[PDB]
Structures are given as structure tokens and as C-alpha cells.
Amino acid sequence: SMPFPKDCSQAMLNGDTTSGLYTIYLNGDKAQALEVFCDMTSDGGGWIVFLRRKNGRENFYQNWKAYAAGFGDRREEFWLGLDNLNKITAQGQYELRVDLRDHGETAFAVYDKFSVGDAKTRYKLKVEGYSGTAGDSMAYHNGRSFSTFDKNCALSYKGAFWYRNCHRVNLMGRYGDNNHSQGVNWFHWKGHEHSIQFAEMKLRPSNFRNL
Ligand SMILES: N#Cc1ccc(CNC(=O)N2CCOCC2)cc1
Fold first, then answer.
1. How much distance in Å is there from the Cα of 79 to the middle of ligand 1?
2. 43 and 8 both lie in a single domain
3. How many CB atoms lie within 10 A of CB 193?
4. Which among 8, 77, 79, 200 is the best mutation to test ligand 1's pocket, defined by most ligand atoms within 8 Å of the CB?
């Protein structure tokens, strides 16, 4: 086992194959402990989950500081934090996976290159190298800064995201809201008038597929 695993891939290779809460260590630094939910079953496992929607119990209409820091219950609905995402994605080349499920139908998107810039970039999104079944709805968002109501798409749709004008992905939108562009949307899968029941966003090293 690795003593200070820097992500869920180094925690999984540590022989922990059950999905659930693990400690990772940013930059392998024992002073930078972070509790994360690891999805150890989806497409080979080793994924840090950084967003989960599943029941509408948690409020995602939250401010910049909340999106920077993270909020919620890792075992249920939560957001990991943009500062965490920046520090993880700085450690190497990461891949994004998005898992979606609605009324028994499932879809996914994988982006071979995924990174989140630091606060001086307003947590700029990079997403490249799409494959999957959900449709490439993140391409629209590539290179955009993060937006919250207090830093207007976030205000207009009462969510938070790497908004443009405004979205094809709104996974931090209002739960069960089928009104146009208000809900948990992935446009190239279920459009803007269908709020998705279950959504996860997760990341792991892009080289995990052959390590
Ligand atoms: N994944 C995740 C996730 C991230 C943060 C929270 C709650 N916020 C939080 O832990 N911060 C940082 C440490 O002290 C308390 C404030 C919940 C879920």
C-alpha cells in the first residue's frame, strides 16, 4: 500500500475495492489530508467523486466561498470544492467521468483531459477528449471560469457552474425542476426540460486505464 495516496486510484491500488470514504493526501503530503468518496466500481474504479445529485435534500444554490470550499455529505449529495479540484488536477493528467441515471436509463461521458485552474483563474475549466453515450455537453463549457450568484447565469438558473450563456450542463441546478434550464440538466442527453434524478462527476489519472 501507499502511505499517503494522492487520489482514489492510489487508494484502490492500495487494495481498497469497496466504494466509500477514504483519506487522500494532496501532493502526497501527510499534512494535506482530504476525506473523499471513492467510486471503486465504475469503469475500473479509482474515481474521486466530486459531485453527487440523487434526492434533492441538499441546497446547491450556494455562494462562491461554499463552491471554493465544498459542502454537503460525501455519502449523499455534496460538492467537493473547487480549491480541492484545482489541487487534485495539478498533481498530474486527470480524466473526468460523468455518470447519469434517470428513470432507469443510464449514460456517461468521459473526458481524457480534465483540469480546474486556481482561484486567480476563477477555477477555469479544461475538458478535452470526449467519449461516451451522454453526448458531449461539456465542450460548450470548455475554458470557462466558474460562476456563482455572488461572483448572471447562476442567479437566473439558481445554480452554479462553469457558465457560458448559459449552459448545456447544469448538474448543480435545482433538483426535480423540469422548467427550461432550471434543473439538473445534460442537454445532449435529456434536454433543458428534464431534470436528471442521479448525477455524479468524478476524476482519476487519465493513465489509470493502462497503469
Ligand atoms: N467531498 C466533499 C465535501 C467537501 C466539504 C464538505 C463540508 N465542508 C468542509 O469540509 N470544509 C472544509 C473543512 O472544514 C469544514 C469546511 C462536505 C463535502
1. 8
2. yes
3. 13
4. 79
